Design a protein around this motif. Sequence first.
Motif, short mmCIF file in Angstrom:
data_model
loop_
_atom_site.label_atom_id
_atom_site.label_comp_id
_atom_site.label_asym_id
_atom_site.label_seq_id
_atom_site.Cartn_x
_atom_site.Cartn_y
_atom_site.Cartn_z
N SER A 91 1.25 -1.54 0.46
CA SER A 91 0.18 0.20 -0.16
C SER A 91 0.74 1.04 0.37
N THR A 92 1.56 1.21 1.24
CA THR A 92 2.48 2.59 1.31
C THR A 92 3.51 2.21 -0.32
N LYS A 93 4.49 1.13 -0.84
CA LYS A 93 4.68 1.18 -1.74
C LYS A 93 3.55 1.62 -2.95
N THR A 94 2.80 0.96 -2.97
CA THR A 94 2.11 1.87 -4.36
C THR A 94 1.52 3.21 -4.71
N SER A 95 2.20 3.77 -3.08
CA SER A 95 1.75 5.15 -2.60
C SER A 95 2.44 6.06 -3.01
N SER A 96 3.82 5.85 -2.36
CA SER A 96 4.77 6.45 -3.03
C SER A 96 5.34 6.62 -4.41
N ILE A 97 4.94 6.13 -5.78
CA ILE A 97 5.43 5.93 -6.76
C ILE A 97 3.98 6.61 -6.99
N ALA A 98 2.70 7.05 -6.80
CA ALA A 98 2.34 7.78 -7.32
C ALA A 98 2.77 9.70 -6.83
N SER A 99 3.70 9.26 -6.10
CA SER A 99 3.80 10.91 -5.69
C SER A 99 5.66 10.37 -6.19
N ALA A 100 6.32 9.43 -7.16
CA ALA A 100 7.28 9.95 -7.73
C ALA A 100 6.84 9.97 -8.93
N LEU A 101 6.32 9.84 -9.97
CA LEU A 101 5.22 9.50 -11.14
C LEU A 101 5.06 11.55 -11.37
N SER A 102 4.42 12.12 -10.52
CA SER A 102 3.63 13.28 -10.74
C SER A 102 5.18 14.46 -11.08
N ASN A 103 6.28 13.99 -9.54
CA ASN A 103 7.30 14.74 -10.39
C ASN A 103 8.44 13.83 -11.51
N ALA A 104 8.09 13.16 -11.82
CA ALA A 104 9.18 12.57 -13.32
C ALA A 104 8.17 13.71 -14.68
N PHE A 105 6.64 13.44 -13.83
CA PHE A 105 6.21 13.70 -15.31
C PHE A 105 6.18 14.74 -15.61
N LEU A 106 6.92 16.15 -13.94
CA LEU A 106 6.21 17.26 -14.04
C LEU A 106 8.09 17.64 -15.26
N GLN A 107 9.32 16.75 -15.18
CA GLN A 107 10.38 16.26 -15.97
C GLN A 107 10.42 15.89 -17.37
N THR A 108 9.09 15.19 -17.32
CA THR A 108 9.40 15.04 -18.15
C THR A 108 8.38 16.10 -19.99
N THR A 109 6.88 15.97 -19.83
CA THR A 109 5.92 16.94 -20.37
C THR A 109 6.07 18.31 -19.39
N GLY A 110 6.00 18.33 -18.18
CA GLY A 110 6.30 19.67 -17.50
C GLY A 110 4.07 19.63 -17.09
N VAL A 111 3.28 18.43 -16.98
CA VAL A 111 1.99 18.41 -16.78
C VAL A 111 1.65 17.16 -16.27
N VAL A 112 1.14 17.35 -14.90
CA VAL A 112 0.52 15.81 -13.76
C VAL A 112 -1.14 15.78 -14.02
N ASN A 113 -1.82 14.62 -13.93
CA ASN A 113 -3.25 14.49 -14.03
C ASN A 113 -3.07 14.05 -12.86
N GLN A 114 -3.72 14.36 -11.84
CA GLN A 114 -3.91 12.86 -10.85
C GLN A 114 -4.46 11.54 -10.90
N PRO A 115 -6.02 11.35 -11.73
CA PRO A 115 -6.71 10.02 -11.98
C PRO A 115 -5.40 9.32 -13.29
N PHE A 116 -4.66 9.80 -13.46
CA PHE A 116 -4.01 9.32 -14.54
C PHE A 116 -2.92 8.72 -14.02
N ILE A 117 -2.40 9.52 -12.74
CA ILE A 117 -1.18 8.62 -11.97
C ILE A 117 -1.65 7.52 -11.03
N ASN A 118 -3.59 7.79 -11.00
CA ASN A 118 -4.60 6.68 -9.77
C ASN A 118 -4.19 5.42 -10.32
N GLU A 119 -4.90 5.58 -12.21
CA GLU A 119 -5.41 4.19 -12.65
C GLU A 119 -4.03 3.09 -12.58
#
Length: 137
Positions: A91-119
């Motif tokens: 649970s905590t592991k999958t939770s941390s991935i979502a938080s790392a994903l957003s930071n990565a999204f800001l670096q790749t394309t500069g746009v973070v989408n909450q549900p896209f990370i949740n799915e």
Amino acid sequence: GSGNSHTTPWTNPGLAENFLNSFLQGLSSMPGFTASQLDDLSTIAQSLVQSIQSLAAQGRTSPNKLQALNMAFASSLAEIAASEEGGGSLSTKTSSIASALSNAFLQTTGVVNQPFINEITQLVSMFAQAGMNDVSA
């Protein structure tokens, strides 16, 4: 020629590498995986880029092909997420991935989408648990 009307991480091997690099780098400092698992994960990451190049080399990228790569990305996370020494709970592991994903999204394309990370995080937790492995009282 021209084009430039399609730019996605999974579609371009350089952008894919940027995604993987930014994600891995940020995730190591998270309570999800460990620097140790992050090293194994670099290999698991590059294995995606090789397959992206295979399709890019023909200038063809079926949606289901690029999508199967995305499903397999989450699939790979569930394996190392089920493995020991990667923090504590899934649970905590999958939770941390979502938080790392957003930071990565800001670096790749500069746009973070909450549900896209949740799915994406639901795939890992669904693959690992594949039912209800724990109880409550």
